[PDB]
């Protein structure tokens, strides 16, 4: 039983909503049954965009920075790119080659690169 509530005073947030998107992507992988893909490749997934585009606690005149477009999208690019990141924080996905525009390797229940980066 017990008494639940979840939250108190927070109308989601780019990060809050994002954190979710992450799982939305991880799920997509298990849906497409893939072991590799790109954030952009998911940017076309309405089911995803619908989230990466969802509203939040914004209230400005867009960003209009290093963006080649107009219609709402960039913002999503921030939720999506972040989504992947989170995944990399959970261990769902991983990137061997650094770079925003890099292939996102999903775990898809299978071997994967080792954490131990080793510098020296």
Swiss-Prot record:
State the encoding gene.
Stn1
Instruction: Using the UniProt annotation, give all residue ranges assigned to the region (Winged helix-turn-helix (wHTH) 1).
Output: 8-108
- Localisation: Nucleus; Chromosome, Telomere
Question: What is said about its interaction partners and assembly?
Answer: Component of the CST complex, composed of TEN1/C17orf106, CTC1/C17orf68 and STN1; in the complex interacts directly with TEN1 and CTC1. Interacts with ACD/TPP1. Interacts with POT1 and POLA1.
What transmembrane ranges does the database entry give? Answer: none
In the record, the note on similarity to other proteins reads: Belongs to the STN1 family.
Protein's UniProt name: CST complex subunit STN1
Q: What does this protein do?
A: Component of the CST complex proposed to act as a specialized replication factor promoting DNA replication under conditions of replication stress or natural replication barriers such as the telomere duplex. The CST complex binds single-stranded DNA with high affinity in a sequence-independent manner, while isolated subunits bind DNA with low affinity by themselves. Initially the CST complex has been proposed to protect telomeres from DNA degradation. However, the CST complex has been shown to be involved in several aspects of telomere replication.
Kindly list the cysteine pairs connected by disulfide bridges.
Answer: none
Organism this protein belongs to: Mus musculus (Mouse)
Q: Which residues of the full protein are shown?
A: 205 to 311 of 378
């Amino acid at each position: 039983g017990s008494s639940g509530s979840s939250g108190n005073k927070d109308n989601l947030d780019l990060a809050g909503l994002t954190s979710l998107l992450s799982e939305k992507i991880k799920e997509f992988l298990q849906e497409k049954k893939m072991q590799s893909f790109y954030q952009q490749e998911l940017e076309t997934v309405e089911s995803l965009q619908s989230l990466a585009s969802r509203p939040v606690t914004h209230s400005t005149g867009s960003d209009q920075v290093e963006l080649k477009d107009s219609g709402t999208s960039g913002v999503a690019q921030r939720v999506f790119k972040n989504a992947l990141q989170l995944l990399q924080e959970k261990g769902l996905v991983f990137q061997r080659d650094s770079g925003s525009d890099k292939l996102y390797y999903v775990t898809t229940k299978d071997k994967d690169l080792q954490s131990g980066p080793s510098s020296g």
